[PDB]
Design a protein. Structure first.
Length: 581
């Protein structure tokens, strides 16, 4: 297929205008450009580019391009700095995967505040003034605001405004374990939304069609919707404005941003012709005008042409909200985010869950990787703690039962109260591990005077994780954890025997000031944790015997033992004591 350009774009786009750009490229270069609009484009591309064929260039929403790239279906693109400067800077952050540019940004789309200019000549700038506005409109038989509450796309702008986010983004990559749906900002935003329903300014049942019908018949002063909705309003007799979404706590609302994007098939022999067509023909005022004249593109990523389009203040408003918004992450973990958050908002809004519990459950289900690593650690710490108590003889050998785990032998207590105390401890730690807030977990051995004799220190690092690749990572990790168990089960040969009558406790060192974690760690009723006293932790003259260190993609960990010479603020400890031996 060398010497031609085959382009796939979706049939709702201006593909006849794109074909006209294709013909000016041909006149000037000889290269014939053929534009096609097949069906089910996004699902056909990973099927036919797996064979190595398909188009040289595919146009689609950017969000799918990050999985294309992890499948290696997209070429890396090499625009000069001077060409990048021609597009709005935030649009390049939507076409980056693993730090590398993988597509050209074309058009930008996001939600705006749409408002009826008979009811509301000046739209509110803050979410905070909508309750008072709705009371004034109710006395006129109207309401202030109606938008889809059934879909998290539409409610996210308010949730994300004060600190919520989907996946954390840095250096052109997403950390699939850093999710911001249950942080302080998300909860404030979802609290405000829920309080609007509580105070009867919105109805929790409102959906897309109910919101559109009501705004378009002059019954509600404002709605929140996208450029796909302008058409129906235009023929509705409502005169409407399109403006920036209100601030929340003085912060911009942050709608999800969609970027129409042009990617290059990694299998293509014409990669250089594709770069030239896209950079010097399409991404120009002349080329975008020809597409936009066929079917409007909305706001565009090329600055000079967007300055022309922005004479339509509707388009200016889309671009301004897009600049303040959150680029929709381009990774396959977004599908778990959407299900999780859709249930959270629906549940919280109809009063079927608390806000804290709705989001907490959404956080652990959107950040499935962070749940997986925390559960692997908690299973391991449980196994480790039992084995420590066996090999150091804190409890007699008759309460233990020989078992298999990580393919090495272990020892598991059958003492129900002991097991219950270790599970309570580890269930409280698990949410802190899910947030990567744990620096150290320390199994402490204490003598009859409640002074520390031994400390088994597990130092924990959880590296940022990208969209998972190695299919044997959990298997490789379990071999690394198995070696920790082997070190523990032969560690009596390196440690002096403990004086008789010892007990044990568990310490958590946190990364930051433990006072923020003081609420997150109280997960079990009647099993509180407190800030540790220096008597609880201070070791008199410690000797540091190292035991094991591992490194892997999901977890770096060091196990060492602090032993006292002669045996015979960021620290949390359970209030309760283990059942004595």
């Amino acid at each position: 297929e060398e010497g031609k350009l085959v382009i796939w774009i979706n049939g709702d786009k201006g593909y006849n205008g794109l074909a006209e750009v294709g013909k000016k490229f041909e006149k000037d270069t000889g290269i014939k450009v053929t534009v096609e609009h097949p069906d089910k484009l996004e699902e056909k591309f990973p099927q036919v580019a797996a064979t190595g064929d398909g188009p040289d260039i595919i146009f689609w929403a950017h969000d799918r391009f990050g999985g294309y790239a992890q499948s290696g279906l997209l070429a890396e693109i090499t625009p000069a700095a001077a060409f990048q400067d021609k597009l709005y800077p935030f649009t390049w952050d939507a076409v980056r995967y693993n730090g590398k540019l993988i597509a050209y940004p074309i058009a930008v789309e996001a939600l705006s505040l749409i408002y009826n200019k008979d009811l509301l000549p000046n739209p509110p700038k803050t979410w905070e003034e909508i309750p008072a506005l709705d009371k004034e409109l109710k006395a006129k038989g109207k309401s202030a605001l109606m938008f889809n509450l059934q879909e998290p796309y539409f409610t996210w702008p308010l949730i994300a405004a004060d600190g919520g986010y989907a996946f954390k983004y840095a250096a052109g990559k997403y950390d699939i374990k850093d999710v911001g749906v249950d942080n302080a900002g998300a909860k404030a935003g979802l609290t405000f939304l829920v309080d609007l329903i509580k105070n009867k300014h919105m109805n929790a049942d409102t959906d897309y069609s109910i919101a559109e019908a009501a705004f378009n018949k002059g019954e509600t002063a404002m709605t929140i919707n996208g450029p796909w909705a302008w058409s129906n309003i235009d023929t509705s007799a409502v005169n409407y404005g399109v403006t920036v979404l209100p601030t929340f706590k003085g912060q911009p609302s942050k709608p999800f941003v969609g970027v129409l994007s042009a990617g290059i098939n990694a299998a293509s022999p014409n990669k250089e012709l594709a770069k030239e067509f896209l950079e010097n023909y399409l991404l120009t005022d002349e080329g975008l005008e020809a597409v936009n004249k066929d079917k409007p593109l909305g706001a565009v990523a090329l600055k000079s042409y967007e300055e022309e389009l922005a004479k339509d203040p509707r388009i200016a408003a889309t671009m301004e909200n897009a600049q303040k918004g959150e680029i929709m992450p381009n990774i396959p973990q977004m599908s778990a985010f959407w299900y999780a958050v859709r249930t959270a908002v629906i549940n919280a809004a109809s009063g079927r869950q608390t806000v804290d519990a709705a989001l907490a459950a959404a956080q652990t289900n959107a950040a499935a990787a962070a749940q997986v690593v925390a559960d692997v650690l908690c299973e391991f710490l449980e196994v480790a703690v039992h084995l420590i108590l066996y090999v150091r003889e804190v409890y007699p050998v008759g309460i233990f039962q020989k078992r298999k785990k990580y393919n090495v032998p272990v020892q598991m207590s059958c003492h129900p109260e002991l097991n219950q105390y270790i599970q309570d401890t580890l269930h409280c730690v698990k949410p802190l591990l899910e947030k990567n807030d744990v620096e150290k977990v320390v199994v402490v051995i204490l003598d009859k005077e409640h002074r520390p004799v031994e400390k088994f220190v597990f130092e924990i690092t959880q590296p940022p994780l990208l969209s998972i690749s190695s299919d044997s990572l959990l298997s490789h990790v379990e071999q690394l954890l198995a070696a920790f168990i082997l070190k523990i089960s032969v560690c009596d040969a390196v440690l002096d025997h403990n004086p008789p009558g010892c007990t044990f406790t568990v310490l958590v060192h946190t990364r930051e000031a433990a006072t923020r974690n003081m609420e997150k760690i109280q997960v079990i009723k009647d099993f509180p944790w407190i800030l540790a006293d220096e008597q609880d932790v201070h070791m008199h003259d410690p000797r540091l015997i190292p035991l094991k260190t591992m490194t892997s993609d999901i977890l770096k960990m060091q196990l060492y033992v602090e032993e006292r010479a002669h045996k015979g603020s960021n620290i949390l400890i359970p209030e309760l004591k283990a059942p004595k031996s």
